[PDB]
Amino acid sequence: KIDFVLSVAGGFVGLGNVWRFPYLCYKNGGGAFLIPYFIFLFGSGLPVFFLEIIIGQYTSEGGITCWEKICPLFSGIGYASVVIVSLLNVYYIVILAWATYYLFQSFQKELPWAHCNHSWNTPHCMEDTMRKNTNFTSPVIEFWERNVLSLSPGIDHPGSLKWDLALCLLLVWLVCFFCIWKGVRSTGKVVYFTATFPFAMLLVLLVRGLTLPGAGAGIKFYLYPDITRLEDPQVWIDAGTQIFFSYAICLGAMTSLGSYNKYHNNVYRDCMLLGCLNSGTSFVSGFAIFSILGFMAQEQGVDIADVAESGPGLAFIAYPKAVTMMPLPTFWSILFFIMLLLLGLDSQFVEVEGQITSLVDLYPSFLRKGYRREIFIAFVCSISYLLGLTMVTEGGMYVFQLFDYYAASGVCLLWVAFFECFVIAWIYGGNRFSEDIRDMIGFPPGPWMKYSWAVITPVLCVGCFIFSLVKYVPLTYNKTYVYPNWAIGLGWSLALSSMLCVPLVIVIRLCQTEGPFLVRVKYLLTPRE
């Protein structure tokens, strides 16, 4: 039991919880975001997670091959999942690059973000303590913006390529390449440290957050709803899609994981444990983040909603401020960023390995015919690194925000989840799926899962998509920068690169099948033996 939970401890916490969830919560007014977060949690998240794991166990193959045994017509779902993973692996590693840059900067007598007396610092800076002793700027925020990021005025101004950040990305990608090539993973005595270190560090960060002299206001802003925020589609899509992204569902990684697990395990209980603790850790780390933000508000004399960036940089603004106020700040900064690097590296290894396995299974005749697999891994790492160079430039933050919003999140996950649940519930048949689950684990899904798949998840996904289309608002970096039309088109292109996979595969298989149209459709709807 303990060993199984420890093996879980590798995968039930990640950057999606520590980093992504807090900034999405902060961006969408805090407490207002929780309502659709929990609604989508119990409506779709756990059932779709269980459904994908069941698919993976039932087929015992990759996320693309299983749909052949389920519904050949909708085989494009696996292709959409693999392209989603491919896009995610490009921009997810930039977080580790920023973490590596912060870790290297932490090897100093004094943390650079503690005070603003350097060459990169604006003359409007004022210390947080003395800011309340105009348009002053906190040293941490502008350290993030100017030193680590060197933020460009817009996406239309890429600027120069930051050599230090490029080297950080190269280091992280080299680590990933060597780990994947040599199959390096936490399996010995080191798994205990690898799993326990994030929660020890998070517990320390949370305890520091709550004990601040202004944590109460931050917690109140974190938990108190604002029902006028639920009238805008953005809080619904962000909260619903965060559930899918955190669980790594709709990516096809879970389908492959289901084929690489020990047998005779109670699948239903394991899925609920994974989901419940994955959501719990996000909700728990929200207290730490928002308590830090509340103390920052009390110190700087500004509103809680304006203290820090409303974007991916929230984790790189709040946490350094927290570690700045602990005894021997350098030690805790080093520990925090090593923790972040390990926590993101394990997930990156998992996703890269899954992508490699999915791609080689598509062409085993050449890719898997011999030692060419290592060359393929090197090719994938190299192409991903070159693609990630675009988000290292001075204007790379806008590209990162666009990628995070569209390429591996947003409407695409809703599309994939809706097609998965619709196919299984209606085309394949909910009764047949329940019969399969009975044969596999011994008991049927129950009314909750069956009705979720049949009604709740499709209704939620379609409602969110239609609500977004009807009440469309453009994406904005932070809350003041408006993206140009071409940038929005590029983001929609990134999303459509995954969404279009299903119709393209459908029409291709319809054209590549003999017989009349009805005969073609019948032959492709009937599951294979």
């Epitope: 005779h264 109670n266 009764n431 019969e435 009975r438 011994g442 008991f443």
Partner: antibody
């Protein structure tokens, strides 16, 4: 579930054939898997075969793997067991049981019919 | 085939005295996949305990079960006159399904 009743038992000869039936009522027959359990005159229970809710998966005991055929009629809510080459050791009482949940076991059992091969 | 064997085939008993009977399995049987059935004389068997600890609807709290892995047992706190029946252990973990030899409480 309330009622499970078997029927069709009788006297046969070695090498003969017989078809056993089990009518079900009080519950959705199509949603629950069914199994046959055999009780020899020595009172020893032996499992015969299992049919899933939809009948897509069918399981048999080693002794009747190539001899007995289990079938169900969801529309008629009736369970059938078919014997092709009954041997001398097959004389026993057959009960149809509901085995939908493998972790809960056979919730209800039928009255049963005695089978003899004298 | 996973053969299940129950040692106390015949057990004379008097009212009030506690009684425990054990089921032994030749292969690893999961805790949730073992169940006991009660069969009165001249009657079809009825479910008694499932998942090795959960009591069926009709069985009173008088009965309880325990065991894990390869040895299982269920005990009676204070046997009554109505407790005289045959109990069979059954494994549901893997096919073919098998039942125990059975213990007939004669009193």
């Amino acid at each position: 579930e309330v009622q499970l009743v078997e029927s069709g038992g009788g006297l046969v000869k070695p090498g003969g054939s017989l078809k056993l039936s089990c009518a079900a009522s009080g519950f959705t027959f199509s949603s629950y898997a069914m199994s046959w359990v055999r009780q020899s005159p020595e009172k020893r229970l032996e499992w015969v075969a299992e049919i899933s809710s939809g009948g897509r998966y069918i399981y048999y005991s080693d002794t009747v793997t190539g001899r007995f055929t289990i079938s169900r009629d969801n529309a008629r809510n009736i369970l059938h067991l078919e014997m092709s080459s009954l041997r001398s050791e097959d004389t026993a009482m057959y009960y149809c049981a509901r085995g939908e949940v493998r972790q809960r076991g056979f919730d209800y059992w039928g009255q049963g019919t005695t089978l003899t091969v004298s | 085939e996973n053969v299940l064997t129950q040692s106390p085939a015949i057990m004379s008993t008097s009212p009030g005295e506690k009684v425990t009977m054990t089921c032994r399995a030749s292969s690893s049987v999961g805790s949730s996949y073992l169940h006991w059935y009660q069969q009165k004389s001249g009657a079809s068997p009825k479910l008694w305990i499932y998942s090795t600890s959960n009591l069926a609807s009709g069985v009173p709290a008088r009965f309880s079960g325990s065991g894990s892995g390869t040895s299982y047992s269920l005990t009676i706190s204070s046997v009554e006159a109505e407790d005289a029946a045959t109990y069979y252990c059954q494994q549901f973990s893997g096919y073919p399904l098998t039942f125990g030899s059975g213990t007939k409480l004669e009193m």
